[model samples]
Target: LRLCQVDRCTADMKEAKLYHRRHKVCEVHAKASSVFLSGLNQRFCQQCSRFHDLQEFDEAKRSCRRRLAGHNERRRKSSGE
Candidate 1:
């Protein structure tokens, strides 16, 4: 038995294999960090609602997720940055 990362519910794969038809996950948010750990080999952010395959984002000096142009405009107006 192992605990799910987000929900922390213990799940036994052996029991599931014997009883269930197939494996399925409950609906929930999947983050970039989680994807990386799970070997999905990808990154995703809900702000853009897009999944970026590995090697797609800029990561030279920092790993910060940049906002989209539309988001930039809003922040500028809201906070006058």
Candidate 2:
């Protein structure tokens, strides 16, 4: 995972889609509401501070730099259709 801005966060860093702060927990830990996934009988995690399968989150390691690809691969693998 990316380095913690505060040197305390240990969780994976999910890039913020919008806003000046790049870190997810830039503000208070205000968890976003949920929206059902329609068919799964479950809902995805709430929008808030959050990981990776592994390398995608790591920044320093040479072998840990496939976040974009890993994200795409996971999406395809998890696609119900």
Candidate 3:
């Protein structure tokens, strides 16, 4: 196993894979860099609750997740089922 490179993060992955084993980064930090920089072929943004093409969101809107999460949370509270 190898250690993750992101600062303040302690995730680890195999050197041959070099993938993010966990929350090795925050959304802002992930945005600051490129997929190539992190060697990530894909990514998921829980804040938006969506997976974006690196090309689409590599530099775009960054607020849908909060809206979706809040909306879903409110629905769950109301449903109570």
Candidate 4:
């Protein structure tokens, strides 16, 4: 009846009938980890507050590229007027 080791998961180890020996996470988080490992690098975008693939984000920036571009565009337009 061990609890899932992943941060937000509430599933029991026996419930999922699966557990990682080293990480001690449930099936859902284990699958998520596998998905993350399989060429799908993701990060949380501060502006959107959602997880997006690495390419959607900007290098060394908190917000996504689109959000930054939109902000800059808005600033440029406002400053010009």
lDDT comparison, 2 vs 3, better candidate: 3
Winning candidate number (TM-score): 4
Q: Candidate 3, overall lDDT? A: 0.43
What do the candidate models score in CA lDDT, each in turn?
0.40, 0.33, 0.43, 0.49
Q: Which pairs, if any, clash in model 2?
A: 1-57, 1-58
**Candidate 1 to native Cα RMSD, angstroms:** 11.4
TM-score of each: 0.28, 0.20, 0.25, 0.36
Q: Model 2 over residues 1-81: C-alpha lDDT tens digits? A: 454333333554465444414543433222212212232222112232332222223343323243422545233355456
Higher-ranked by lDDT: 1 or 2: 1
Error of 4 at 46 (Å): 1.7
Which structure among the candidates has the greatest lDDT? 4
Across residues 1-81, which tens digit of lDDT does each residue of candidate 1 receive?
442342443444444442121223212323325354345555544455555555555554213266432235333345445
In candidate 1, residue 55 scores what lDDT? 59
Question: After superposing candidate 3, which stretches have Cα over 4 Å from the reference?
Answer: 5-22, 26-29, 37-52, 56-59, 63-81
Ranking by lDDT: 4, 3, 1, 2
**Alpha-carbon lDDT of model 4:** 0.49
| Evaluation by TM-score, superior candidate among 1 and 4 | 4
